[model samples]
Each structure stands twice: as C-alpha cells, then as structure tokens.
Target: LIDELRNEDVQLRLNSIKKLSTIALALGVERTRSELLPFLTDTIYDEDEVLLALAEQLGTFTTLVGGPEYVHCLLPPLESLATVEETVVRDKAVESLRAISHEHSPSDLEAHFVPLVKRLAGGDWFTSRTSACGLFSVCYPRVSSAVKAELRQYFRNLCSDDTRMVRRAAASKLGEFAKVLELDNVKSEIIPMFSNLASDEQDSVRLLAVEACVNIAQLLPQEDLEALVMPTLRQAAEDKSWRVRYMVADKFTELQKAVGPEITKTDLVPAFQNLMKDCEAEVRAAASHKVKEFCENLSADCRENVIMTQILPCIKELVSDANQHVKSALASVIMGLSPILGKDNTIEHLLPLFLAQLKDECPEVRLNIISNLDCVNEVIGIRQLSQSLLPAIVELAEDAKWRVRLAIIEYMPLLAGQLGVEFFDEKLNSLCMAWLVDHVYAIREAATSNLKKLVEKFGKEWAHATIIPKVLAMSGDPNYLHRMTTLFCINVLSEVCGQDITTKHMLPTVLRMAGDPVANVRFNVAKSLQKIGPILDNSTLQSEVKPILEKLTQDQDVDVKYFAQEALTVLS
Candidate 1:
C-alpha cells in the first residue's frame, strides 16, 4: 500500500502521500515509521501545493512521533526546503522545524544552525527571514555553547541590519538569547548591544530593544541590568508615540521595583503625571491604571502620604477629564484605592469627586462609575452605599450602552445585602427582569445570579410574589439565554420557595426545559432539577421530577447525563 503511492502519475503520488500522512497521524508514528520516512527525501520540488501539504502533514506527523529519532529522520528535507522559492513551502518547512526543535535537544539542532542563522541574519525575503528567526528563537536554548559563541558576532551584526524587520528579528533573537545564556554572558555580551538598540531611530527597534532589556533584566539581577537600560526605559516612557508611553506605563510597576521605589516616585512619577493628561485617551487611561496598581502595592505609609498625596490627587483631577477613557480609568483608580482609603475616607474624600463623575457627559464614564460602586459598598457597608450610590446606579442601569446596563445588573448581587430587600423591590426588580430577557447572554447570566442573591436575602415570599412569575414568563422566551435565565430562577425558587412551590410551578417549567434542543439549556434544566430535590418529597420526585430526570439521563450531552445522575442521587 505504501509503495503504490510512489507510482509515476504525479497526482496519484500526491494523493497517496496525503493518505499515508493521514494514516500515520491516526496510527501511532512508530507503527507507520517505515512507510513515512521515504517521502521525506523524495525530489518532488516543482509540485508546490503537494510539497506544502506534505510539509503541513509532516508537522502533524512530528507531533505524533516526537523525539530525537523522528527528528533525525525529518530534519534533512526540512532544512533543504527552508530555502524553497515559494513562501508557503518555506513557511511549512520552518513550522515543521519548530515542531521538531520543541521535542529535541539543542545538540540535535546543531546541523541546522548555519542554515537557520544565515536565513535569519539577512535572508532575502520577509517570509524566509521571519520563519528563520521564529525557528531560531525556539531552538536557541538547545544549540551548543560553541555554536552560540561562534554566532555571537553574527547576531551583533544583524542588530544593525537595514530592514526594520531584520532589526526587529535581531532584537527578538537577542531577547531569546537572554533565556539561554548565563547572566554573566548576557551582561558582558548581550547587554551592550541592547543598550545601543534601545536608542535606535526606528520606534519598533527601540520597542524591541526595551523588550530585550526587560527579558535580560528579568533573567539577570536588577542591579546588573538596571544601570544599562533604566535611562532608556525612562526615555521610552516619554516617547512621542502613545504606544511607547503605554508600554512604559504597563511596565511601570516592575521598573519601579527594579529601580527602587524612591527613584521611581521622583523620576518616573512626573512623566506618568504628564501622561495622565496625554492627548491620547488610552495612554492616559493606561497611566491611571498603572498609578492605581502602583499605589496598591506600596506600604501603608507610602499610600497615605506619598501616593494619596501625589498620585491620587492627579487621578482625581482626571475623574473629570473630557475623554471617557480617562474618566473610566479614574473610576478604576478610585475602586483600587477603596481598600486603602476605607469607607469613611472614601465617603468624605472620594465620594464627592466620584459623584461628579456620575454626571460626566460620557456614558462610558457613567458606566465605570456604576461598575466600581461595589468598592464603595465594601467600605461603608450597603446601607450608606445605597444612600449615596444606589440612586445613580439604578439610573445608569438604563444607560444607552448595553454594557453599562449589563454591568449595573451584574453589580446588583453585591449591592443586594446593602440596598436591603425593600429598596431592591422598589428600585431594582423591573430592571432585573428586563435584563433576564435581554438578548445578551452575559447580561442574562448576571441578572440570574443577582436574582438568586435577592431571593437568598429577601426570602421566598418576595421572590414568589415579584420575581418568580417574571422568570417563569421568560421560560417561554425565544432566546436560549432567556431559557437558561429561567432555569437559574427555578433553582433558586426551589431552595427559597420550598417543595410546595417546586411541585406546583418550578417543576413543570424545568421538565419542559429538559427537552430543549440546545444542549446547554437541557443541561441547565437537569441541574435545576437536582436543586429542587431537597425541597420535593418522594411523592413529588417520583410522580413529577423523576420522569423528567430519566429522559435527561439519556441526553446526548455528557453534561446533561451527569446532572441527571446528580438529580437522582439527591432525590433518592
């Protein structure tokens, strides 16, 4: 069957090779080893599509076989194909090489080093060069120390390559080398090149240089790499590019720790302060998140004295920034600060400022305000949180953005205990029901979870009187999410409303859902039945629920099967 594939007809040969590759993948490689090897060295170069397909199949084949022996059999043809004129063929070859390298040791990759390095160093086309760099990045750790030593100068030369792509590759390769090389070797050799590239005219080169320096610093001690690269990082923080500023802001916490807190506060803080007013809203927003994270990690004294004094004040100013992103960031900053400030201080110092943000013209800003109120609830307790924040939250629950409305619904569980049963009945019940039937799955889930909390706190009378009937009505909704929402409501009703209600109302709805076409809806129905068991007596379980559970037990979805078993266990 294997030799028959080697017949003279090109198309037949191609088809045969593909079929054999598929069989090799399905059967373990060891069983198909002899059949798979001959195709590797076959000179079928002009058949580009066939060669590309074979390379892809070989990649899958390598994962199955996986080890030095398979790698040895596979490497020669792959190395030869790396220089193929067709980009697709070249990409496939590199992908195959990468898979082999992942399984084999660095020493196993020694023979392919010269070809990979030459292609990576200044290979003519983007596809070949990118693929070569990718393969080298993977295999660099396994290559011999002698090969690395020989290639060190070659790597340094590539750093100055004319193409930005090549320079980016050089920077990435240097970063990769940091992983493989010893700290002393990195500091002595790699660090010098990184420092030079960090100031390169091209932004991407400089960005990659920062990444390489970060990798090197992480691998080596901070003291060794900080002096060499810290200035570049600080410079990058203020680069004209918002992306560069964002990258620096994202790394601000790590850089602060490595460079020490005091230096960061003094040197890095001002630039970050300026970034809080950056023209680009995202940069400013990222800067705000970074500042909050920085303050959260500081000592109690530093948070109160330095961060609260210096950083929070600036962030508070941006709470009114025209950009929604900046205000959204400010809301996050306020939420992050809640633990440190406590409820009393948050009310006295932060709430007034936060209240102003609630009226900010941007709906996103209003959304952020609603989203973070849980923090306010956390410190002050629910009662005061309801007094000061709930009105705005309830208003924003109808905000134009679906996400904001959904977010407000999501936060209701946290607020339920605080707002108390009476306030929820008056202010939140309608919105919760509306959200339950919402088109969005996430909104429906949030509404369902919030309804459960409401029931747990307020008792079955309130749920049965107000929420349960609404949820039952939604059971007949056209959307699957609405059905899932109704299922959750039934689970809660069974627990809170007791066996009588489960037997009367919830059981019938759940039984119908057990036959739902959507697997998820059917599985959720089974779960709801298990929850109803504690409430239902044997008469109800056997006469009413057991038949539904039996049908679901035969469901095709394994999840439905498991839940059906669970229901039976609880009832029995």
Candidate 2:
C-alpha cells in the first residue's frame, strides 16, 4: 500500500490516498499511526486535486485511528496540508482539523491543538497563519483564560498581518472568532482589530471586514454598536472602492436588523439612499435589488413615512436610471411596494413608475414589471391595473424578444381570470393565436399549453366557440413548422376538449395531416392519435381513428411509420 502510494503516476497516489482507511484497518492502530500518518505528513507535495482528496478523507478517519484518545494523530498530516500553496487544499485541511477538534478533551485541545495553532500562527510562511485563524474559534470556549488570551493576541496580530491574503482570511473568519470570545474581550480586543481591518488599504480586505461587522454588530448590545462598530460600517458604506460599498449594500438588511429600528432610521436609511444612487452602476445595481426587503424590514411605525420620504423618491430616479441592470433590478422588487403603500398610494404614487417601467426600452425591465402585476392587482384592483397597464401588456404579448413574449404567455390564465371572457376574447385572444405560429418553437409549444389552461379556466364550450376554429384553421399554414405546431395544439387540446369535440372538431384535422408531406408533422399526427386514442369511443376508433393510423403505419418516412405503428398498437 505504501509503495503504491509512492508510485510515479499521480492517479495511483490519489487512489492510494482514497484507500488510506482500508490500509489503516488492515495495518491495525499502532503500525498505522507509526507508519501511515508520518508518511502522509511528509508526502504533502502531490497535485492539489490529490491533496484535496486526502484532506477530505482524513477528516473522517477519527474512528479508524482508535477514537478520541488518538484523534491528535490525524492532525499532523492535516497540519502540513494547511500550509500548502493551494487555497482549496488549505481550506479542506483546516476543515478536517476543526472537525476533529471537537473529538479532543480540554487537556488534549490545549496540549495538542493549541500548540499546533501557535506554531501555525507563528510560522515563517503566511500560509500557516491563514490556517491558524480558523482554529481559534472552535477551541476558544473550552480553553483556560491564559490560552484564550494568547489566542486573542495571535488573532490580533494576524488581523494586522503584512500580507493582504492573511488579513483577508482573518477578516473572513473574524465573526466566528468573535462569537466565541467573552464580551469584555470582544469590546477591548475585537473592536479595534475589526475597525482597523474594515478600513484596510486593500478593498478586498475591507469588503470582507464589512461582512464581519454584521456579526460583530449582532454580538454587541445596541448601546455599544454606534461607538464600536457603526463608525467603521459608516466608513465602509461610503468607502472609496465601489466594491466595499457593494458589500455594504449586499449585507444591508442583516446590518439593519443588527442595529435595531432607531439606528436603522438614523443611520442605515440615509446610507441606503446614498448607496441607491451611488456613482458606480454596480453599487447602484446592488442597492437597487435590495429595495423591497430593505423597506419591508424597516420598523412598522416609520415604514411608510420613511419609504414615502426616503425610499420612493430614490426609486423614482432608479426607474429612469441609465443602467438597464439597475432599472431591471429595481423593477423586480418595486411591485412589492404596492401592498405596503395600499390602494390610494399605489394608484397615485406608484402607477406612473410601473407604467414607465412597463414600457422601458429594456426587455427584462419590461418583463419584471409584467411578472409581478398581481401584487399591484391585489391592492388597487385588476380593473385599474388592466385599464392602465393593459396597453403595455398588449405590447409585451408581442414583444420582439421571444422570451419576453413567452413570459407574457405564461401569465395568460391569470389575466384571463382577472379580465373575464368578454374582455379577453376581444383584446387578448388574438395574441394567444398569434403565439401558436410564433417563429420560436418554445412560444408555439407554450401557447399550446396556454390553450388547455384557458379551456380549463373558461370551460370547453368557450374554447370550442372562441379558440377551436382558429386553431383548426392552422392545419393549412404555409410553414411546415406552423403546421406541426397545429398538430401539437390538437394533442393537448383533445385531452381537455373531450370525446365529442375530439371526434367532431379535432379528428378531421389529425386525419387530414397524417398525409402531410413533411414527415415531422406526419409522425406527430401519429403520436397525437395515440395520445387522444384513450379519449375516443369504439365507433371513432374503428371508423375514424384506426384507418388513418393504418395508413401512417405504411409511411415512407421511418419515424412516421414507427410512431404510427406504436399508435396502432396502443389504440388496437
């Protein structure tokens, strides 16, 4: 096993690493400890993929190494792994080390684990110290006061480390470390380090520090937040790098809840408005996306007052914002504001913004507004929503982008339910038929399902009266693809349209199309016959259905003949 592990091919070495537990089981505890672990500890120079596999496999080896008493034996190989150049290898190694740390008693943790952390924290290479930052949080709560202090000091040093990479790792893990620290130390030791890291010269480190402050803010009481954390958070929100502000914008609501309502009104509301209108499209886009949740998370007493005064005005500008992404992101959540504002406020204040967005040059912006109109519908009534927004809906139902047109197709049943049959037939029914021959197959296919849902909503009689004749007429469409789509529509409609309608209205179309010169349409005619076969009675199966499938069974096209044979087998 050892020689195979050392074999020249990297695959053999990786395979050997994966099978280490089986070898350890065969070797028994003592030889495996003496022989296997020491060899792995020295052999950490393999490819990172092999080493990553080794790091993960070693995490579960605690039972194989004779349980908690000998869990420390697993640490040496992982310790070497924690200092490797590859970040993923080091992360897995640290994860394995943390996983096994819980297996140690207090004495074992301090004696074995603390010293390993100390060595890694003090090592000459920056890699080891990066790994050391994650070790303190798991062991800190159980350790004696003296080791905890030393651990805090080591962490403080890494937070101000010369290398940006080490500081980033420390910043990323700061929240987990602070969670386990005593309150007094969090005030004295963690705050200064957190504040310093939040304003680090590197934007990458500062952004991570913004994430950490969310944890620190949650850890501290409200009284201490403004003094200790908010100053740094304020600076981070307006930091020179757009990336740091983007992080603040991304984590805004978590920060809002952490600081409580009063501070949210005083601090975060203004900060959010600034972020909402930030010069970088990226920052504005980030803040724009969070508008609804951020407003929703505001204190109930001041929620509307603040939104009307603070959030809505900025939202007005965002609707016309130059960046399509900013407008699109705002469009996504803007409908949510309708329920919050109620009828009069939505009609008076929010409708024009919805209208402008509905006709926005960007398709996604238009699509987003159309997707959530139901939210507006509930507050103001569909009568008002349709009267104002129906033109936009009509335009979008024929949107130049097929996907945008498809988005409108999906909402037809909702619209039909709200708009009623008389309104839909006169205004919206033509749009449904137009989609049946849409250049995009997905639109045509979705239109087919849309018809079934409409029939389900409006009853089969309404479908036979309003939709059936128009769809049946498409059998002679100049395009073969449209002819195929007509057959596709019959396949779905037959199930919902019932026996009389299937035999009366749809049966003639399927039999006529079975001889379609295009084989795709002909084969689909066969499949449609099979699908609707269960819906037919004995007379139609013998007289009308059986004869056409028999003719298709002799089709010159193999696919047509094959599907026709399958159809005949099922129907027979």
Candidate 3:
C-alpha cells in the first residue's frame, strides 16, 4: 500500500489514500503518524485530482492522527492543499486544517493557529489570505481572547484587501468570524468592513458583501441592523445591473428579518415594490416571486389590514403586466401567499387574480398556474378547486399548444384524485379518453398513461363498467393508431382491474388482439398478458393465459414472439 503511494497514476494514489484513511483509523493514531503520515506528506504535490482526494481524506484523519504535535505535520500538506489554484483543492484543505485544529487544546490550536492564520492571511499570494479567511471560520471556537483581539485587526485588513477575490473570500467568512467576537467588536469593527464590501466596484464582490452582511446582521441590535445593513440592501435593490437588482429581489425577503418586521413593512416593501415594477422583466419577475415572504412576516392583523392592501394590489397588477415572465412570477407569488394570506383572503383577494392568470395570453403564464395547483389546492380545498379551478385545467387539457396539452395530461391522475369518482365519471374520464385519439401523438401517449391513473383512482367497478368497454372499442377502431392506445390501456388496466375483469371482459379483447395483423397491436397483446399473468389464478392461467401465450409464441413478428416467450415464463 505504501508502494502504491509512489505510483505515477493519480487514480491509484486516490484509492491508496482512501483505504489508508480507514485502515489507519483501525491501526490507531500513534501508528498512523509513525507509518502513514510520512508517506502522505512525501507525495503532497502529486497532481490536482490526487491533491483533491488528499485534502478531503486528511481532514478525517485528525481524529485518527491526534493533536497539535500531529497538527503541525498536517499543516504542510494541508497548506499546500489550501493554497492551490483550484477551488475544490483549496476548500478541502481549508476543511482538513479546520478538522485538525479542533482536535487540539485552545493552548494548542491557538498557540499553533495564531501564527499560521496570521502568516497566511498576510501572504503575498491572495490564495493564502483567502484560505486563511476560509479556515478562520472553522478554527474560531478554540481561538483565545487575546488572539481574537489580534485577529480583529487582521480580518479587517483582509476584508479591505486590494484583490477583489481576497475581499470576496473575507466577506463570505465575516458571518462566521463575527460570532467569535464581542458585539462591540462586531458592531464597531466587523460591519464597517461589511459595508465597504457592499459598495465595492465589482458586482460579484458587492453581491457577496450583500449576502455576508445579512448573516452578520443578527449579531447587531435592530437599530444597528437598520442603519448598517438596510442601506446596503436598499442600494443593492436599485443597482444599475439587473443581476444586482435581481439578486436583491431574490434574497431581500429571505434576509429581511435582520432589518426588523417594522422596517420590512415601511422600507423593504417599498424597495421591493419598486423591484416588482422595475423596467426590466427579470427584475420584476424576481421581486414579484418573493412577495409571500413579506406576507409571512407580517402579523395576521397587519396582513389583513395594511400589508396586503399595499403589496397585493401591487402584486395583482403584475398578473397582467406586459411581460410574460412577470405574469409567471405573480402566479408563483400567489402560491406562497395561500397559507399566510389564508383561504378567505386568498379566495376574496387573490383567487380573482389567479383566475385571470388561468386565462393569460401567454402559454407560460398558463403553465405556471398548473405548477402551483398542489400549493393552491392545499389552501383552497378540493371543492373550490372543482368549481373555480377544474375548468381551467380542463381548458388546457386540450390546449392549442401540444406541450401544454401534454403537461395537463400528466396532471390528470393528481387532478382526478383531488376530484374523486363522481366528478371524474361525469367530466374528466371522457376528456381523458378523447385524448387517446388526439391529433398529436405526444398528447395521445400521455392520455394512454392517464387511463391507468383513472381506474386506479376510480376502482374496479368504474373500470369494468365505464373504462374497459370504451378502451376495447378503441382497440378495434378502424384506425390502427386507435388500436395501439387500447394496448397500453390494457397493460395498465390489468394491474388494477383484478382477476375477474382480466379474465372476463378483458380476456376476449386481449386474445383477439394477439391475432391482430399489425405487429404494434399484436406486441401489446403479448405484453398485456405478460403483465396480467402473475395476477391470474393457476387454473385461469392454464386455461386462458396459457393458450394465448402458446399462440403468441408463433407470432409472425419476432418482437411479438419475444414478448410472448417472456410472458410464458411468468405463467409457468
């Protein structure tokens, strides 16, 4: 295994490292350091993929390899792993360094880590400083108070570094870094650096700053949160780049708690409202999509009184907005609004607008409404869905666009399960059957899938009474394509319809189809019997299923013969 370590192939070394990380754990820490650690450090520069595996595996070894005495030895390979140009390698090494650091004493890790962290955070290569900031997060708990004092200035320097990447790395780490400090330290020293990053020239750095400050916000008082973080959020909300504005809309309500519920109403809502109406369609789409988060934070009384009146009206306007994506966004926002806004308000206030979306000019607008039914139905209940919602789904089930028709067809079972037997018998079953003969084969294919869902939901009597006969008639339809739909219907129906229906009504039609001239029709005949064979009683299998399989084995088409041959094995 040690010899495999010197092998030129990276994959071979990775396997050697993996086995040893486990084997050394059994061999125990003392033996691991004596036997294995020397060999691992020797090949630390092998290649990228090899280093990637080493960086990951070595972290797990800290518990096996023991503390600060062992800690310094772990550092060379780990620091090289950490400083590499590749992110996967750097992250793993940073992670491993952390694991090894935690196993030691504060006197051990701090005494060890203070010099290492300071050196790396001050290095000429930005990789070293970035790695230090990354490692700073995991090593923070063991850091002593006096060293924490030094790290305060050191971290502030890193956050203000000339390289955008270094500052970006520091911004990401600031949240984790704040917890290791006093509020006075976090409030005074930490967030000012957070603000400066938020104002950075590069959007990527500023974006990270926006997200990082939100993480640090909870450590400050509500007043400080408003003053320190809200301005950054407000500025980010209107940044000239759509990406910045879109990000603010995306995360604004997610991190808005830091800004306080009071400020969220007065300040963030208005900022968010502007985003919802931003001239760019992408900005409005992002903003309108998160309105429910705002709804969730408002007190029910506030939601009922002031907040809904403010936001819902603005959001309602988005439903008919010129842009299709904004309309789609409004459809999503209604789903999130359902539970927080409650059934009454959702029905009174939102449902009217939701219905308008059902009739939206753009197909994407209509499609987004279908996506939200599960969420919407949970809020509105099954009955309101029947009266208000079922028709919209039915309308789209035969839509002008075939893809839209395909999507609605996919939802049929879920729709039927929600609707139950009586409504399905009267309404949906007929429409579902009609799609079997649809002009587009894709819609027909989906309808064939829905047939099984229908009987499965509605049961054997509905299958034997209504569904089976129509499918059988379609099986003999003069059009061979219609006959093909019956084949799929029979395969699915066999599982649900039970032995009695499979033997009785289904038996005759399937046996006849086994002799049908078209190979497509004949293939499904063998396939349907294959599906039903296990479900039949032994006597029934021998008397009925056995004969059909016997005939099908002699089928003219080889595909038909193979399916029959497979079915015979099931019967026997």
**TM-score comparison, 1 vs 3, better candidate:** 3
Please give the lDDT score for candidate 3.
Answer: 0.76
Better of 2 and 3 by lDDT: 2
TM-score of 2: 0.92
The digit string of per-residue lDDT tens for model 1 on 1-572 reads 55655576778767776775566667657755665566556665657867887777667666555556556666656766776777688778877877767766565567654555565556666545655655556655667777777667667767777778667767876777667777677768877778777777888777766566567656766454447666767777777776777777766677666555555566667776777777888887787777657777565555577665677678777876877767776776566577777767777777677778766666666667665656666566555445646557657676666777776675677666656667777776776777766666677667767777777778777777887777788777787877787878676557767766767877777788777888989988877776677677778778877778888888889888987878788766
How would you encode candidate 3's per-residue C-alpha lDDT over 1-572 as one tens digit per residue? 56777788767887887776777757767887777776666556767777787888887766666755666667766766767788778888888787777766777767667778888998899888998997776666667777767777888899889998999898888878887767787778877787788888888787776567677767777877666777777787778877777777777766677666677777776787788789899888877777776677765455666557678778777887999878876776577677776778878887788778887767667667767677767867757555656667667876788888888787778777766668788776778778988899888777877877777777789888888888889866887878877877777788888888888887788788777878877878888877777777789888877887888888678898998888888766
TM-scores, in order shown?
0.70, 0.92, 0.91
Q: Best-fitting candidate, measured by lDDT?
A: 2
lDDT by residue for model 2 (1-572), tens: 66887788988887888877788889977677777788778856778878999999999998888889999888888888998988899989999999999999999999899999999999899999999989988989898999988888889899989999899989999999999988988898889889888888898899899779999999999999889998999888889998888999999888888899889999999999899879999999899888889989888898988999999999999999999999999999999998888888888888889888877878788778767867877767777556656677778887787788888888778777877578888888887888887778788888899999999998889989998899889899888887888878888889988889989889888889887888889999988888888888877898988888889878789888998889878765
Off by over 4 Å in 3: 8-10, 23-31, 45-47, 67-69, 336-338, 342-344, 374-391, 399-403, 438-446, 478-481
* Native-to-model Cα distance after best TM-score fit, residue 43 in candidate 1, in Å: 8.3
Candidate 2 lDDT score at position 336: 92
Off by over 4 Å in 2: 1-39, 44-47
The count of residue-pair clashes in candidate 3 stands at 0
Clashes of 1: 2
Give the number of the best model, judged by TM-score.
2
